[PDB]
Amino acid sequence: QQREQWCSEHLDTQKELLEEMYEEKLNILKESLTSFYQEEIQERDEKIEELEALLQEARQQS
Amino acid sequence: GPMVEQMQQREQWCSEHLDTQKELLEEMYEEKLNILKESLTSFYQEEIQERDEKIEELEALLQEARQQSVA
């Protein structure tokens, strides 16, 4: 009985700390990619705004 | 003596399991990383594509509007 539960306690602690180490890695990746992609999304949103305004004008043009 | 040996045997037995867990956890992280890269890419690609297609549609609505204004 006691071997399993003595080791398993160090196994629990190791897993918790390694899961934290890896979760930070995953977050750094998640944040870096999303900042890159939100920049690309923003550049496109600004072009959509420009084109929309031009359209406002062309319809009002006649 | 043998009491020391029983202790060293228990310690090594556990050490080997901690090593195996360490390697298994890294594989689980690699898979979770793969899933996350794939989810984030696929999501932002769809968003980029959708916006690219709006730019093209707006460009064709603009040309149409200007054709009707000239006419």
Residue numbers in the entry:
A (entry chain B): 601 to 662
B (entry chain A): 594 to 664
What do the paper's sentences say?
To address this question, we used a dominant-negative E413A ATPase-defective rigor mutant of MKLP2. When expressed in cells, this traps the CPC, followed using Aurora B, at an early step of the transport cycle at the boundary between chromatin and central spindle microtubules. Progressive deletion of the C terminus of MKLP2 showed that once amino acids C-terminal to position 650 are removed, Aurora B is released from this mutant MKLP2 trap. This maps the putative interaction site to a region between amino acids 650 and 750. Further fine truncation mapping defines a region close to amino acid 640–660 that is necessary to trap the CPC. Sequence alignment revealed the presence of three conserved elements within this region: an acidic patch from amino acids 636–652 that our structural analyses showed forms a paired coiled-coil elements, an invariant RRSQR sequence from amino acids 675–679, and a weakly acidic element made up of amino acids 690–705. Mutation or deletion of these three elements showed that only the first acidic patch of amino acids 636–652 was essential for interaction of the CPC with MKLP2 in anaphase. The minimal binding region of MKLP2557-668 exists in two species with molecular masses of 25.4 and 63.7 kD (yellow traces), consistent with a dimeric and a higher order oligomeric species. When mixed, CPI80 and MKLP2557-668 form a single species with a molecular mass of 100.3 kD (blue traces), consistent with two copies of CPI80 bound to a dimer of MKLP2. This proposal agrees with the dimeric structure of the core MKLP2-binding region, and dimeric structure for most known kinesin proteins.
The Aurora B chromosomal passenger complex (CPC) is a conserved regulator of mitosis. Aurora B localization and activation throughout mitosis and cytokinesis depend on three other proteins: INCENP, survivin, and borealin. Together, these proteins form the tetrameric chromosomal passenger complex (CPC). MKLP2 actively promotes the movement of the CPC from chromatin to the central spindle at the onset of anaphase.
